[PDB]
Design a binder for this molecule. Structure first.
Ligand code: PTG
Ligand code: PTG
Lengths: 316, 316
């Protein structure tokens, strides 16, 4: 069902002087590049990697920039979509891949949509878990839309360098145990986070283990976030204006490659209806939907995700 | 094109607890595994890697065990063909590859033949540069046949641990410059070695650069061999009796998969006539022959090698 880390092939590509990307590689056939969200790991794909490899695909599961064994420079702007996307292009180039299928989740989903938008020639097909494609509005700056949405208040808590880092870094076991839970097991404070104290303030000093994860799984994440901590990961969130500026340069060009949007019923931040008018911009869009599935889609509902991904990969 | 190392994707697979194999990877398509000889590197395939990738192949060029970034344990028996082949099967297993084409040269070529003989289900097709397949004789150990050939005297000089190590390691740049030359430029001393005072008696202290290589190329080999020296590499030559016993367990089976033997006119050790009658063991054997080509085949005639390999890959 899953991956044992020391049993994988581990690859490293230098995409620029400062920066190498690590990834794990399994399988033969068309290249499928898996891109995780915040605050995750290649390992978040642990149930998909063997499944897609067995279905006849060559899987490359990334540590995204800021995570795991990939470099984690401290500057905020090293994590804007524009920089991350160019770097993913160089990654392909150095591997001698002219294209790959890109599949992302959360921030990885965002990334893959912008890859499809700006580098369609390098993207065979694109799929997102939970993250919709929303075209930028040149009259709506990002900070206004985020204030309108109360469940997005945690993104404001993430802006100030050092603040979310100190809470997240305080106790890594507690961090991951409090984050990685089914929606019904969650006690995260998302709505008035700065004023509440932080994300974890109404959550135990020793949380129980979610039914989704084992202690061993939790400890792999703990160990992975020792090397660089949370700064780079959090920087993904600190480029809103820059990313908005870059997206407005699309100037309504349309994604024409095959595309798959998978929504999760119980993701309370990336809610299904935020995807609702994607076919106005991607008319051939295909969809999948997973009941009883929270934010941590690949872990919560691995069987359903695998089924949806393999069916789509095999047809489009 | 050749290859620039820091522009490559580097892969690492742990084949057993304290043994990991390094490789470089380029291209999409059917997996082709390149296996170098003594005393070389993945970098000996520098001209084939991009040619083969451009031709539609996914190239994995290994550091073989003992070399470069791969593990180099000191024990002689870690480098017998039986141990080396089972590790390559495990390599494929961990990469999720049910098969690959195996292309070897010199000791790598010996390895690919044992892979094709003993693990044909994992070898889609096999190609060797210079190294013939020789059926083992269950009576005469090759001991006497090795003694019979004067140009294999260097192999006897390689037997005693530490002796050839000291000569080869004394001045790495002189080693590689003395080794890596077209056959017409060689001044290697191969017949009387144990007695006559080492491989390099006739070599200038500062040899000129063969027309086949640049200084920067030579220096890459120097840097590689600083990590683990010559003991692992030399251990490849120190398992003749074990290899002969393993090969006798083949009980005269044939190699039934697609196979290519490439001879080199001016290799004076792996002479072309040594491949005569290979088709009696290998029904689907194709052939290639390179004129004016010495032992360092990939480097001496890279254009002819590329053409020969690609044509055979595309047909068989
Ligand atoms: C900083 C961590 C980013 C992870 C984003 C959390 C996402 C999603 C969740 C759910 O979809 C369900 C629980 C978490 C947080 C949302 C909580 C809403 C209040 C809990 C409830 O009453 O259901
Ligand atoms: C032991 C280190 C590996 C060296 C294997 C050398 C292989 C092959 C050669 C040739 O095919 C041609 C030159 C080298 C060594 C053979 C030399 C014979 C004497 C040179 C001469 O003709 O005067």
């Amino acid at each position: 069902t899953s991956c044992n880390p020391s049993d994988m092939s581990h690859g490293y590509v230098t995409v620029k002087p400062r920066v190498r990307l690590h990834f794990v590689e399994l399988g033969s056939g068309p290249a499928v590049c898996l891109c995780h969200g915040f605050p995750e790991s290649w390992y978040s794909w642990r149930y998909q990697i063997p499944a897609l490899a067995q279905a006849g695909y060559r899987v490359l599961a990334m540590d995204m920039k800021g995570y795991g064994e990939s470099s984690a420079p401290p500057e905020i702007e090293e994590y804007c979509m524009e920089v991350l996307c160019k770097e993913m292009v160089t990654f392909l180039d150095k591997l001698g891949l002219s294209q790959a299928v890109f599949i992302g989740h959360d921030w990885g989903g965002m990334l893959v949509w912008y890859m499809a938008l700006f580098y369609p020639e390098r993207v065979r097909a694109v799929a997102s878990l939970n993250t919709p494609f929303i075209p930028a509005n040149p009259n709506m700056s990002p900070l206004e839309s985020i204030k309108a949405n109360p469940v997005f208040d945690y993104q404001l808590y993430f802006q100030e360098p050092g603040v979310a880092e100190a809470e997240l870094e305080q106790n890594l076991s507690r961090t991951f145990k409090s984050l990685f839970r089914a929606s019904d097991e969650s006690v995260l404070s998302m709505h008035k986070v700065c004023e509440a104290g932080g994300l974890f303030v109404n959550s135990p000093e020793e949380p129980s283990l979610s039914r989704m994860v084992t202690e061993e799984e939790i400890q792999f994440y703990v160990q992975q976030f020792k090397k660089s901590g949370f700064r780079g990961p959090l920087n993904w969130y600190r480029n809103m204006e820059r990313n908005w500026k870059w997206a407005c340069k699309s100037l309504g060009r349309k994604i024409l490659i095959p595309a798959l949007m998978v929504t999760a019923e119980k993701d309370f931040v990336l809610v299904p209806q935020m995807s609702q008018h994607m076919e106005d911009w991607i008319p051939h869009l295909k969809r999948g939907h997973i009941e009883d599935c929270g934010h941590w889609t690949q872990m919560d509902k691995p069987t359903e995700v695998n089924q949806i991904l393999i069916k789509w990969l095999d047809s489009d």
